[PDB]
Write an enzyme that holds these catalytic residues in place. Structure first.
Site, PDB file in Angstrom:
ATOM      1  N   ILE A   1       0.796  -1.233   0.000  1.00 24.53           N
ATOM      2  CA  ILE A   1       0.000   0.000   0.000  1.00 24.53           C
ATOM      3  C   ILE A   1       0.832   1.290   0.000  1.00 24.53           C
ATOM      4  CG2 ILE A   1      -2.090  -1.038   0.933  1.00 24.53           C
ATOM      5  CD1 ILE A   1      -1.263   0.032   3.698  1.00 24.53           C
TER       6      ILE A   1
ATOM      7  N   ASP B   1       5.144  17.504  13.075  1.00 21.91           N
ATOM      8  CA  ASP B   1       4.948  17.348  11.621  1.00 21.91           C
ATOM      9  C   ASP B   1       3.467  17.268  11.240  1.00 21.91           C
ATOM     10  OD1 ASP B   1       6.111  17.249   9.007  1.00 21.91           O
ATOM     11  OD2 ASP B   1       6.137  15.052   9.069  1.00 21.91           O
TER      12      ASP B   1
ATOM     13  N   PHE C   1      11.771   5.570   3.093  1.00 21.96           N
ATOM     14  CA  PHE C   1      11.527   4.933   4.403  1.00 21.96           C
ATOM     15  C   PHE C   1      11.486   3.396   4.374  1.00 21.96           C
ATOM     16  CE2 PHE C   1       7.194   5.145   2.687  1.00 21.96           C
ATOM     17  CZ  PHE C   1       6.652   3.933   3.090  1.00 21.96           C
ATOM     18  N   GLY C   2      11.025   2.845   3.253  1.00 22.38           N
ATOM     19  CA  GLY C   2      10.878   1.405   3.083  1.00 22.38           C
ATOM     20  C   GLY C   2       9.604   1.083   2.324  1.00 22.38           C
ATOM     21  N   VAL C   3       8.902   0.041   2.768  1.00 23.33           N
ATOM     22  CA  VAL C   3       7.697  -0.459   2.098  1.00 23.33           C
ATOM     23  C   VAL C   3       6.602  -0.690   3.139  1.00 23.33           C
ATOM     24  CG1 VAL C   3       6.848  -2.117   0.390  1.00 23.33           C
ATOM     25  CG2 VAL C   3       9.300  -1.761   0.622  1.00 23.33           C
TER      26      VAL C   3
ATOM     27  N   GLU D   1       5.259   2.843  -0.618  1.00 22.77           N
ATOM     28  CA  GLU D   1       6.665   2.588  -0.880  1.00 22.77           C
ATOM     29  C   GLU D   1       7.398   3.913  -0.939  1.00 22.77           C
ATOM     30  OE1 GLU D   1       8.915  -0.931  -3.221  1.00 22.77           O
ATOM     31  OE2 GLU D   1       7.275   0.049  -4.318  1.00 22.77           O
TER      32      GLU D   1
END
Length: 294
Positions: free
Chosen positions: A14, A127, A19-21, A16
């Site tokens: 969902i 943030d 940061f990664g997946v 990518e």
């Protein structure tokens, strides 16, 4: 079928990025749906383990997803939390990038409450953006409740034991997203609770207007762009932001801009201020949102 943390089955990807997946999935021991994030083990700045630690502090807070698992497997760090629905930015887009007043008032009061609860756990968010506030899943009691995720920027503003506020300072490098950041953040001032509240006010106007007057500015470099956006924020009268809109949103932003560094926000006062808009319009906070017409 790929399994992590002994009993979390991975489903569709969902998201990518650097940061990664991110995948959806299932807690197989009880069938509850989860989100599973994978961060490369050898990464420049690791956030996932620290984020888990933040989630454990929060675990039990209403409308913040529970963190079920953190561990290192294969070549990744892995975090498992409750699966939620679309973000407010997703819903905004689907709704043509403008929300009605009734939707914004109802969402605003819930966002204030989420941030109040975060602040109660000794943390500032730092943030604030619509991308990190999400609704629930269809037919759940919290289907249209606002939830908060992504604690990568969160920081302690007071000692958990003593409640001693962090010290004031200036000359800080710019942290957070330029569009919503407080005037004091622009001036390199140490962030505290007020800065989360002001950023919320910016997000509320963004929802109501579709854009803020400091979007689409040109600068030679990012540092200069940050500077220009800050000047525009300082220059822009709160009632220019609120034109054609309830004055309470202008007043909200005026109030949170005047908070002192250590000052505790009047969360309940802000909720009552914003709910009074509905009284003015003869509307009611009955849980009907723009996206429910999609």
């Amino acid at each position: 079928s790929t399994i992590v943390g002994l009993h979390y089955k991975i489903g569709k990807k969902i998201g990518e990025g650097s940061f990664g997946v991110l995948f959806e999935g299932t807690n197989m021991i009880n069938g509850v749906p989860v989100a599973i994030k994978f961060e490369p083990r050898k990464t420049e700045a690791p956030q996932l383990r620290d984020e888990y630690k933040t989630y454990k502090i929060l675990n039990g807070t209403p409308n913040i997803p529970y963190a079920y698992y953190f561990g290192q497997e294969g070549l990744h760090n892995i975090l498992v939390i409750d699966l939620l629905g679309p973000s407010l930015e997703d819903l905004f887009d689907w709704c043509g990038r403008k929300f009605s007043v009734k939707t914004v008032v109802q969402v605003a009061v819930q966002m204030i409450t989420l941030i109040e609860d975060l602040h109660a756990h000794d943390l500032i968010y730092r943030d604030i953006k619509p991308d990190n506030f999400l609704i629930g899943r269809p037919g759940q009691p919290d289907a249209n409740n606002i939830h908060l995720i992504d604690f990568g920027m969160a920081k302690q503003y007071r000692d958990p034991k003593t409640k001693q506020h962090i010290p004031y300072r200036e000359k800080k490098s710019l942290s957070g997203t330029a569009r919503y950041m407080s005037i004091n953040t622009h001036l390199g001032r140490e962030q505290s609770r007020r800065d989360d509240m002001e950023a919320l006010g910016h997000v509320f106007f963004y929802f109501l207007r579709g854009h803020l007057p400091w979007q689409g500015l040109k600068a030679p470099n990012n540092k200069q762009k940050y500077e220009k956006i800050g000047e525009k924020k300082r220059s822009t009268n709160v009632y220019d932001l609120a034109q054609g809109l309830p004055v309470q949103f202008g007043r909200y932003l005026e109030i949170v801009r005047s908070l002192s560094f250590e000052e505790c926000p009047d969360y309940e006062g802000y909720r009552k201020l914003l709910l009074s808009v509905l009284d003015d319009l003869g509307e009611t906070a009955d849980g009907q949102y723009d996206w429910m017409k999609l």
